[PDB]
Design a protein around this ligand. Structure first.
Ligand SMILES: Nc1nc2c(ncn2[C@@H]2O[C@H](COP(=O)(O)OP(=O)(O)O)[C@@H](O)[C@H]2O)c(=O)[nH]1
Lengths: 37, 430
């Protein structure tokens, strides 16, 4: 009897080697100092 | 010279402070290296309120950053304006609380808090003449809600006549982040009502609603929320730093807003707040500012003031304006909304004018109001807490390191007593 033909297989299980952060707001106007007094 | 120190606790408190100090530095013209590069002289005449002088001509904030896990403070140290803080002021634990009020108040707070009391003492009584303390924290987190309130207790015991201020973040059930919120919230409220001179409640639900509706921006972030909170915080104490037509500080505000000793839970709101597309369609004027101020939706809480009565109201105006117009608008509002104002307190709005507006704005207003509507928050929190405590859910974690059910019963009793006392004046008649 002939068992088979597939000669070797010999391979096991192998695994090969192989920005929110800031904010979005605010509106700008020129600075206005010099209080009323 | 009547300066106020800053103590921030917990992850939420640290995030709040990291933006508040950026806002203050931007306002006062302090560079991230701590070197002054301002444009006028008024920016330095009252800089001693929030800063300290060091050798070489640099300024250092008088802030104390305390927490149980070093991750948050390591994150905020590497960010912008993170080099201002003195590296000594960083105090941290090694284990954390794990959203446990018992751990944050009994088992790690007792061991750690000695060092932070030492540094608070050093910073506070190294000053010329202390004005008070201000604290930022949230009542939904264990380490904050516990260690911060124990700090409040010890600081109040050592300084009985100073002004204590807290910006509290109250957890809402609609947008919930922790399943143990009712327990530590109730315990923190019970420990806070006895000690804190002033307390303010902020709600992330209301912040989300404002950011979605008024600013009309698609995706808000915790940066934006912290920016609104920082603007609100700076609005309260601007008058203490800048000259104005009518000057008014924290003690004056507390005296004029607190009728009875245990009624010191306020809600705040800010104006103007307009979207970028409609920013210039509006006109900056006192009537528009006051109507947006008294708009119910603009408030930073889910407690709707139209469901109750305003005991008192406060409005801090920033900019140059006419006092006759301000008074006329206040009187007009108080007459047009007679139903929502309790009657035995005639002329129950305080007003103030500060000549220096926020940077980038010509007119801005900070509003603080004490209305009988906040009792709904207390009622809902008490209902959830008693529902959870009826079946003794999650109770073993809290009872395993010192507490008994008697303190929880006492907290429920005090919370209900506060609710009843606070709703008593809602229906009172003259
Ligand atoms: N406004 C605001 N709230 C925050 C921020 N970060 C966290 N929170 C709130 O804080 C709560 C959790 O606090 P937590 O981190 O446990 O505080 P801790 O225990 O003291 O560290 C959540 O319900 C959040 O809504 C923030 O940057 N801004």
């Amino acid at each position: 009897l002939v068992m088979g033909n597939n000669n070797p297989q010999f391979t096991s299980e192998a695994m090969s080697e192989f920005l929110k952060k800031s904010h979005f707001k605010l509106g700008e106007d020129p600075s206005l100092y010099e209080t009323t007094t | 010279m009547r300066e106020i120190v800053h103590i921030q606790g917990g992850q939420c408190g640290n995030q709040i402070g990291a933006k508040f100090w950026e806002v203050i530095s931007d306002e006062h013209g302090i560079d991230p290296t701590g070197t002054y590069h301002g444009d006028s002289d008024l920016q330095l005449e009252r800089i001693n309120v929030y800063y300290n002088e060091a050798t070489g001509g640099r300024y250092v904030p008088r802030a104390i950053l305390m927490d149980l896990e070093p991750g948050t403070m390591d994150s905020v140290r590497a960010g912008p304006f993170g080099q201002l803080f003195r590296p000594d002021n960083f105090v941290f634990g090694q284990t954390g609380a794990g959203n446990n009020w018992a751990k944050g108040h009994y088992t790690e707070g007792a061991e750690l808090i000695d060092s932070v009391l030492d540094v608070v003492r050093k910073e506070a009584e190294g000053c010329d003449c202390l004005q008070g303390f201000q604290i930022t924290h949230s009542l939904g987190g264990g380490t904050g809600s516990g260690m911060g309130t124990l700090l409040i207790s010890k600081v109040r015991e050592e300084y009985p006549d100073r002004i204590m201020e807290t910006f509290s973040v109250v957890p809402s059930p609609k947008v919930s982040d922790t399943v143990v919120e009712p327990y530590n919230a109730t315990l923190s409220v019970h420990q806070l009502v006895e000690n804190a001179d002033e307390c303010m409640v902020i709600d992330n639900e209301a912040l989300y609603d404002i950011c979605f509706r008024t600013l009309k921006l698609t995706t808000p972030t915790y940066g934006d929320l912290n920016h609104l909170v920082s603007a609100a915080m700076s609005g309260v104490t601007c008058c203490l730093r800048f000259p104005g037509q009518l000057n008014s500080d924290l003690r004056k505000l507390a005296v004029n807003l607190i009728p009875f000793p245990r009624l010191h839970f306020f809600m705040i709101g800010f104006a103007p707040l307009t979207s970028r597309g409609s920013q210039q369609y509006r006109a900056l004027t006192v009537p528009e500012l006051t109507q947006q101020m008294f708009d119910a939706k603009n408030m930073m809480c889910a407690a709707d003031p139209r469901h109750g009565r305003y005991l008192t109201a406060s409005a801090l105006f920033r900019g140059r304006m006419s006092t006759k117009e301000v008074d006329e608008q206040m009187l007009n509002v108080q007459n047009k909304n007679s139903s929502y104002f309790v009657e035995w307190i005639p002329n129950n709005i305080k007003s103030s004018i500060c000549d220096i507006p926020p940077k980038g704005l010509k007119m801005a207003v900070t509003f603080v109001g004490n209305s009988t509507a906040i009792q709904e928050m207390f009622k809902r929190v008490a209902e959830q807490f008693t529902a959870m405590f009826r079946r003794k859910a999650f109770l073993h974690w809290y009872t395993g390191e010192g507490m008994d059910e008697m303190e929880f019963t006492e907290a429920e009793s005090n919370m209900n007593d506060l609710v009843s006392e606070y709703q008593q004046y809602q229906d009172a008649t003259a």
